[PDB]
Structures are given as C-alpha cells and as structure tokens.
Design a protein around this nucleic acid. Structure first.
Ligand SMILES: Nc1ccn([C@H]2C[C@H](O)[C@@H](COP(=O)(O)OP(=O)(O)OP(=O)(O)O)O2)c(=O)n1
Ligand SMILES: [Mg+2]
Ligand SMILES: [Mg+2]
Ligand code: NA
Length: 326
DNA sequence: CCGACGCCGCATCAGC
DNA sequence: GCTGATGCG
DNA sequence: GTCGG
C-alpha cells in the first residue's frame, strides 16, 4: 500500500480507456504501469523516479507529479463529472455488459440500476444473471469460505468419478486472503490431447454440483468451460452466504501443467510471461508451449512435466504461485 | 518514428 | 444449418 | 500509453 494512491489513480484511468474510450491498449498500458508501481518497494516521491520503471513513460510521469503535488488528477475529476462516462463506467460493472452494450444502453436511456431492473427484457441470459447478483458479485470471498467451497467441490467431484482431479486456482492458489471468485481446473484420464474417450465429462460434474444445490445458475457452458454461480449452504436461522461466481475449466490431462500455470495467473503475470516467451521465441497458451519458426509459425508442442519446465524454456527463474500476484 | 501489444472459450449475429 | 466476425469474460 | 530496434 506504499503507493496505493498512485496505483488507484492509474486503475481508474485504465478502466476509463477500456469502458469509455474503448482503447484496449491504453487500458493495458495503464494496467502495466499500476502493476509495476504496486510492487515497487519505496514510497514514490516524484514522476521522474517513477519514469525509471518499465511501463511508466512521460505522460504517466506527469500525471504522478500532478497527483503528488495536489492529491488529485484533473483528468479524472472531469471524467468523474461527465454523466455519459460515469453511466457507461457503472453499467460495465454488471457481468455480461461490456463497453459496447453499456454505450448502447446509455444511448437508449438505460443509465441506472433501476433502469436495468426495469428493462430486464432487453438483457441476454448472462447479463440477466449478472444483474440478479450484482450486489453479491461485488463482495470479496474470505479465504476461510474458499476453503469450505473447495471441500464441497472436491468431494462432489470424487462422488461422480474417483478419477477426476479438481484443483482450485486463481488468486486462491496464489495464497490470497480473499478472492473475487472460485476458479477450478478439472482433469479426467478419459480426455487427453489424443482422444476424448467419454462424452459429457464437464456436464456430469456440473449436473452433480447442481444436484446438491451448490451451483445455482449458469452464465455460459460448453464442452470445456463452465461459467456460473454457486453458494455455500448456511445453518439453521443463519443469514445466507452471498452468491459467488464459479469458473470451471476442463483441460486435457496430459496438458495439466500449462493449464494450471494459466489458471493460477495473475492476468498481468500471464501477460508479462507470454510476452517474454514471444521475445524468447516461444508461444504459450493454456495447452502447450511451442517454438516459433523462422516464419513466425508456432511449431509442435514441447514436452512439459512441471510448471517449472515452462519457466525453464523461456529462461525465467521459477516463481511460486504466491509470488505471481502482479 | 512506429508497429506491436497474450491467448482463447462460449454466446450472439450477419450472411449464405 | 454452417462459417466467420464480434462482444465478453 | 509505452517501448525496442
Ligand atoms: N485477462 C485474463 C484474465 C484471467 N486470466 C487467467 C489468470 C487468472 O488468475 C485466471 C482466473 O481469472 P480471474 O478473473 O478469476 O482472476 P484471479 O483469480 O487471478 O483473481 P480474482 O481473485 O479477482 O478472481 O485466469 C488470464 O490469463 N487473462
Ligand atoms: Mg478468480
Ligand atoms: Mg474466474
Ligand atoms: Na461487465
């Protein structure tokens, strides 16, 4: 929290460029600068001191000087005053409403939470569920609740078939004291890069977690990725727990280590790592790391038997999950 | 300068 | 129906 | 918005 004022400012600027300007590279520029400053271990005293970090350049340096001198940023104070930008920024907080849909709703005069509740008929299925649980999805999940959720999911998966392996990833696996959601990596030996020997491998899991009333809603669902909603059971007379976002991803078993590296994140860590892979002549996705040829075309999957094997290919010292929260 | 910026699953739609 | 682009996560 | 070549 040494430079929390600066990194908050940059995050608000990034969200502006994404939601309002629809300028995804500016959004990623601000996010990379906020990330490098957040892990900088001194209280920043000038914009020139910050410009020495990679991803902080002239414009952000000038913004850091304005912020340190005055405690404010005029650019943001004006953005905070513009109704259209403010309304667009708000609507994108609903899961399933991105910047395009948010600008379209505002064009049609749908600009508040009351406006969305009134116009449910204009929402697709995902947006409908995101509105339903808007308040709950804003809350963080204490690690102690993630531990009980973990216990439910792993035990219910064992009951379907003892050969499934379920691994909680995301910020939970990086050791966070609270999470935005539950991310679950799933494997089963009948599903590899070579063959799919059983159908419905993810369906069966979803159905079982629905049957015991853990999963309560579905945002999207295919053969390998489920995005939905879940809730801890409460006790007699106790207030219900908040509803929570749950993401489940079935990865070919022989590609576990690429998949667990991806699903552990953080998103900025993955971005930095994948960009560094490119500079080193490889491409990394959640399935494989492959070399790039002279023509820039990905070649065939390199062999991988651990998370560290991937770090080794691109000549990075290994970083434990807890050190990947960028 | 200025091109490149990580990578992909699912939902939806246009065009056929 | 399928294919490809687009939005969203 | 930033940066490497
Ligand atoms: N743009 C993104 C977003 C996510 N992910 C990967 C890394 C994340 O860790 C993982 C799960 O994404 P989440 O949105 O669930 O984020 P986290 O679990 O890291 O954090 P939170 O505590 O906010 O859920 O997916 C990624 O590679 N690129
Ligand atoms: Mg998560
Ligand atoms: Mg998630
Ligand atoms: Na949204």
């Amino acid at each position: 929290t040494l430079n929390g004022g600066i990194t908050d400012m940059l995050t608000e600027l990034a969200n502006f460029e994404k939601n309002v300007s629809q300028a995804i590279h500016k959004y990623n520029a601000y996010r990379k600068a906020a990330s490098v400053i957040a892990k900088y271990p001194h209280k920043i005293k000038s914009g020139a001191e910050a410009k020495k970090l990679p991803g902080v350049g002239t414009k952000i340096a000038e913004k850091i000087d304005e912020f340190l001198a005055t405690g404010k940023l005029r650019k943001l104070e004006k953005i905070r005053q513009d109704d259209t930008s403010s309304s667009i920024n708000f609507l994108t907080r609903v899961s399933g409403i991105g910047p395009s849909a948010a600008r379209k709703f505002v064009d049609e005069g749908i600009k508040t939470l009351e406006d969305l509740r009134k116009n449910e008929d204009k929402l697709n299925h995902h947006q409908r569920i995101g509105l339903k649980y808007f308040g709950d999805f804003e809350k963080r999940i204490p690690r102690e609740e993630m531990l009980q959720m973990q216990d439910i999911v792993l035990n219910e998966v064992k009951k379907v078939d003892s050969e499934y392996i379920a691994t909680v990833c995301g910020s939970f696996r990086r050791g966070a004291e609270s999470s935005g959601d539950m991310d679950v990596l799933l494997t089963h030996p009948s599903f590899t890069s070579e063959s799919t020997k059983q159908p419905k491998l993810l369906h069966q899991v979803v159905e079982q977690l629905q049957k015991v009333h853990f999963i309560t809603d579905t945002l999207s669902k295919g053969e390998t990725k489920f995005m939905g909603v879940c809730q801890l059971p409460s006790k007699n007379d106790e207030k219900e727990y908040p509803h929570r976002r749950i993401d489940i991803r079935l990865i070919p078993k022989d590609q576990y280590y690429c998949g667990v590296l991806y699903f552990t994140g953080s998103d900025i860590f993955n971005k930095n790592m994948r960009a560094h892979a490119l500079e080193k002549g490889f491409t990394i996705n959640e399935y494989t790391i492959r070399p790039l040829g002279v023509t820039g075309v990905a070649g065939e999957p390199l062999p991988v038997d651990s998370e560290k094997d991937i770090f080794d290919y691109i000549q990075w010292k290994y970083r434990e999950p807890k050190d990947r929260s960028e």
